[model samples]
Target: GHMASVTRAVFGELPSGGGTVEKFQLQSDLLRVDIISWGCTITALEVKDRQGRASDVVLGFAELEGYLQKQPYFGAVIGRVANRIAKGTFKVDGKEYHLAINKEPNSLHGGVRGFDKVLWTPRVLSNGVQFSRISPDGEEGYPGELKVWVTYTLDGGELIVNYRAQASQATPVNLTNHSYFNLAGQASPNINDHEVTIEADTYLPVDETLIPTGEVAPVQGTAFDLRKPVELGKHLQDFHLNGFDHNFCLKGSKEKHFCARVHHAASGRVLEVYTTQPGVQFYTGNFLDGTLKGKNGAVYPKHSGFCLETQNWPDAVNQPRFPPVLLRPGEEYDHTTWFKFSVA
Candidate 1:
């Protein structure tokens, strides 16, 4: 018999009345992940440490009620465009479009009700679960009816997320999973002690409003330089915005390459990210301010976790030099990111 199994259960009821949310448990020899249909969110991810002690490494809520409220992106899938759209405007073949200004001056994730707010239709797979949805044309002021599929598979010690999309018309498309991780544990005080390394040389700088300044700057002599393993505590305290919210440009080829690695010395737990995308946003949970109560009534303060969101560079639709994210009728959009966990 195989060492992995998939189970389904009802997580909760949708606030919109009659619909129910479903939860799928994908359990393997090395990892156990709980994902819900609402937003295609990863509710919990349990990974074993060096001493064989298992702990939840990703930040999430235990009940559906927690996710029903307005919190950070948490462990949800983000799309039609993941990051920001400058001033909520973009042009597609000489035609201009305007999206909701959800993130102040820019349109973030996907508009006011991005992919994270909708319920996804789930399909069970042998070693994983696939969530599919169709974003109607002009849903959030974006053209084209996009059909998106996100599949999460557990292979050995790795959790692989594969994203596939096809559009009825030409439109900008970028997708990413916004999962905050504290390799030590979800309830860990902070990621300050986690040693991190990112395989990138150039990064996108942002202005006061956190939108890309359209310049791809070098990370060599800047705080963005994460070429080597550096403990976060030492560098975060003095950095701008108190931590990182920058996008590091990767060596984007057709192949998926190493993106980042985080090592928690105390627990001897390590998390590695591999992706086919051109950039990865390195965020330090800077806005977590002890306001949102997470799993087990845990209050998440600033720097409690970090996120390595692998996807196309932010504002790629507007930045002429950034990697293009336009998806058309005959073209297929496919990208994958692997979260490999182990003891180091």
Candidate 2:
């Protein structure tokens, strides 16, 4: 239940214009994870396969600048609201609030400077690394002084991310990590060959803007079905517009549950995602067009990796039928999502 001796470092200047970038590293016999207080991002994750070969399984930048303009959320934790919020407007407690609509008609990832871009305070404990941040009222169209804490722990071969938040006033909050995973590492292009299985019978259908149409349609007869192990690129030929960037409704309630699992056949590496959220957004890195340079000057191409963002349903605050994401005062918001890794 305890972590081994870990190291801490500082990188670029924080977005707050003063504090230094904080990084925490936890290492064990089988795994190593580097986490940054900036956005509570899991900057790096290294694990040994059956052959005992170590490789970073998560995609990220070597420095902080890479995340500033990068479209690929990478290993950053996003919040206030994890997904789109429909024109960045939602009514809470009879009051209508307008958020920063960076994604045109929809407000994606809690507005421009959402949790992914915030510099949180770091505290290294014996069990894990904890990063905390406080969002003042009206910071991003949300009302309330939101206090957030994200902790990352690496035990054996598992990387657990825990999120806890409290708001003085009622507000909407949904948080999740945006880690682009490539079990075999990012040296290879396209994860279409990897086998993925999501334990979800239905998914939210979205329009051109990627906003949910308030429909939780069945995945039985569509390419959205991933109940069985299938090639990551199986339906790419038909989905010409945007690869696989849709939300899958997990079978159980938004309590503790296992949402999805992915495996890389070549490397025999497997990743299981467990969360207490109702849905998991499966994104195939459709925008990684090989133009943006990543760690060690590597070009990130399309489908280079994928992300399983576990959180409340997208636009849940506005959609009456979707699960509620409202957080009232005195009510603690706690959720956990873990990315467990192992060799198949």
Candidate 3:
């Protein structure tokens, strides 16, 4: 049995903040992950296919400079709140707070200066790395002082993300990693050919602005039915819109259940997701036009990547029936999601 190893190197200097961003490399027998302190981003995740050939399966830029540009979340850890809040407004304990409307008519990924754009303090673990940061009260128009810790661990073929946090006062907290994947390869043109299976019996339907409409509708007789394996290209043809950008309500309790599975038959690579969260956002890179250049001079066309973001329910703070998002003092927030790589 081969032992796992952890190493680190300087990725680059912070553009403005006079700190160094370090890249931590975690390697096991069947997987290798390169995670940077900036945003706790997974710069690269190399996993072996059926033929014993390794390739980076996650979409990201080649250098640190690319991350500095205004791009999608990429592989960053989204925070404070992972998804959208209605009209950038929410109340905690009868105190209404307003956030920056970065996503138009709503607050996205924790206002303008979310955790994804900060340099986290890194502490090397025995087989992984932990990134920590402190969010001051009202930094992003949010109440309370929040302390967050994101840990990434690679063991054998499993890459696990563990999120821990504590708040000084009552505040809504939701954290999730936004990693777009193309099992065929990082630079693959489209993910239409991949096979996806989500273990949810119902999904949240979003309104015009992509905010949940407070309806937890059943997936039966609709395109959202993904309890069994469904091919992307064949299944999505029935829909008029670009592709899926909805959240699936995981059927079981929030006690670590099998969330989803994505497979690429041509490469014989499979990804299985298990999480303790109550929901998983299934987004097919519908907005990724061929205009943006990706790693190795690769132009990402529409549907090039897919994101399975295991998180709390979107707009859960406003919805009285959805899972609670409030984290009060003396309560510790813990969320874990595991990604297991294998061959079909």
Candidate 4:
């Protein structure tokens, strides 16, 4: 058995913060991942394909400067609330609070300064990094102070993300990782050639603003139906313009369940996702604009990558039909998501 190891190096200095950030590398037998303390961003995830050849599978920048610029969430931890909250307002215990409307008409991924942008204190573990942070009450208009821990562990061919949190009061809590994958490895043109299989019989439908409309409809016979493996581009070929950006209802109930699988035949790479959350958000990289130069000067255009966010439903605070997102003072918020890598 190959010994799991971890190493650290200075990634770069934050342009605005004037402090040096560090990137930690964790390696197991079949995979290696680079996670920067800044934003807990995954700078690279090198996994071996069928042929025993390896490459970085997640999309990110070569410079810390790139992350400081305008870009997608990339491989960052999302929270306080992972998805959108309606109209940037939510009521807890009869008190209504307003969050920063970073996204038009709503609050997104916590607020302007979500977990993805803040520095996470890191501690080295046997084969991973334990990132911990405290979000003070009212940090982003949220009601209570929240202490969170996200540990990224690499064991054999699996990269496990473990999330835990506790708040000072009853508050909405949803945490997830936003890692756009190109199983063909970083710098690949697009992932439309990849095949996806989401083991979900139902999915949440959204309105114009991409907020769930409280409807958990069947995925049968619809483009949202991903019960079986299908090419990522098939919907686009059929004129589903923006691609998938909806939540698939998983059989998550206190235990991790199979959520999704993404495969790229050309590289023979396969990625399987399992989670303990009730939902998984499948988002094709519909927002990439080709202007952002990725690792090794690769121009990341639309559809360059895709994200599988294992989280609570979008706008869950407002949707009574959805699973609850509240984490009270005495209840520990525990959730785990795993990404197992292999090749067909």
Candidate 5:
């Protein structure tokens, strides 16, 4: 029998806003996830491994307040512009629009408090939790009134995230689920030993501050290559790569394509990532400084987990050659990314 239930509980109160922040759970036969109203965050994702033992596979604190404060984006829905917006500015129709300076002269993650910081009222589905919210025009120094949906669905051993948005005017609309995955399970020490392969012939280069340099560089001869599967920790030292935070340029497709696959040797767990988006940002949790305490009282150090964020492209609004992210009236924006897991 296939069954799914959406359960709710009090997580905490919104920081800059008032009201009880509710946490919802979508539990199916093989998986269970905890999603908070604020940020629409995936606080907990329990997945079964080879031995049929389920473990929390995503990173998060034991309590809710930790996320209401500071942490990496974690398992949350990022939007209105997921990556960096250059110079904290962009021009549309010859009119210059300036954004809030959250990242030192650049607008980072939708000007500080993006969709990740907002609260959501979900409409439950048979196999998922559907979240919808509206961003008023100029809410984050953006032009249009944008409506968005961040839905999560669990089917068998696969976790699917559906991102949809529609804007009243032409506005940048690149949304993604920023989830750190460590198939050895969240309580595992590190993900450096995990192996990954990306389906991309080339990758984009970024400047000192992590913004695309407008160059579509070939990854064939660089350290950014992940076309062939390799352990991250072992191969990284060869190229002096501290960790990966690069976007692998995927060949465009109208339907969802297999983009990346990761394997953790210790647990014999495999993660296959699929998406309809044109690019996937592969990150190796290089910023986790061990200062934050995570699940089961684990100290999260660098290389704790990895993120495969599917989207149009980083800084695409400024770079015309990249896939366009402008969502205008009468146009619907949609992107679907799924994580399918199995035992090796």
Candidate 6:
């Protein structure tokens, strides 16, 4: 089965005072994925059914302003560092460096205005869309001038995103797409009914502020076990924690691995995640308490959506045991992740 090429619409607009928005459309035989230069975000992902009906699989805002203030990361590509770094401090090459303190005493998603907030340049490719951005030295307290490129390709029923970058100065870099998915559709009240399956046996436990404790514990007898397809809400009440919001140690090779599989029972939509990273963060939208209104005036309550962030473990640059997220000079940093959609 091969993916069929479809006409992609390219357009640009100056939304803010200077930022630009470029759009790209990738269509396979049965799916369509739209990408935007701003935030390297997946604007829309549509999958067709046996009856040829198309449904958007990912939730997002209709305008650029919504993404600027929306706490919901939506479908933006996050980088420099994806998750939290303890105390906004990390030692690199025996030197302690401080990062931007955006998430209180800690740093989240590479500080306030990370890569997700930056505008990138888009180039229409023969098979997909390529978005590029250049991060100047000390852009967000990170020490490096990094040039990054992300390509979105729709092949068959899968939507693949390839990230490539290089830096002139050594810096800590971790990239991942922050796509909150509710396979049951955007209006679904809760994703609790969705079934999730993870191939890992252990997960990185976190502290109160959601920073990893540097411990990789087994999920054998715990509620975190997802080796088999299980309802996402089954373990909601078991622990003091609100919901699933930890990183699981991905099993198999770090080069390329099948990390997780999720299914929405009502919509018959399935999303299979594959990555070349060492860990996958499974966030069940525990922080959303109905305070922030989403697109279409929808209140995003707790468990409104879920995120599978594939990348190096959180605080990896500070943890010696975890895989390093450091990008040395002259060395290229590359990774890939895919969300393959299908019908049950």
Lowest lDDT block of 10, candidate 2: 234-243
Tens digit of lDDT per residue, candidate 4, span 103-154? 9988999999899998888999998899999999988999889999999988
TM of each candidate vs. truth? 0.98, 0.95, 0.98, 0.97, 0.96, 0.93
> 147, model 3: CA deviation in Å?
0.8
- What is the lDDT for 82 in model 1? 94
Q: Pairs clashing in candidate 6?
A: none
RMSD of every prediction: 1.4, 1.8, 1.1, 1.3, 1.5, 2.0
Descending-TM-score candidate ranking? 3, 1, 4, 5, 2, 6
lDDT of 6 by residue, 1-344 (tens): 36646454444555546655766777777787777778888767777644567776677766666676756677898988999998889877777788888887799898878888888888777778888989998878788899999888877887888889999888888999988888776656788889999999899988888888889999988888889888777656554447788899998575778999998766678889999988999999877788765656667788888999998899888888988789999899999998888888
Please estimate how well model 6 matches the true structure, expressed as its whole-model Cα lDDT.
0.82
Q: Tell me the whole-model lDDT of each prediction, alpha carbons only.
A: 0.91, 0.84, 0.91, 0.89, 0.85, 0.82
Q: Which sections of candidate 1 miss by over 4 Å?
A: 1-3, 238-241
Better of 1 and 6 by TM-score: 1
Sorted on lDDT, best first, the list reads: 1, 3, 4, 5, 2, 6
Weakest 10 consecutive residues of candidate 1 by summed lDDT: 235-244
The weakest ten consecutive residues by lDDT in model 5 span: 1-10
| Tens digits of per-residue lDDT for model 5, 233-318 | 88898888889898899987859898999987667778898999999998899999988878788778888888899988998989
Off by over 4 Å in 4: 1-3, 16-18, 239-241
Clashing pairs in 4: none
Q: Give me the displacement of residue 112 in model 5, in angstroms.
A: 1.9
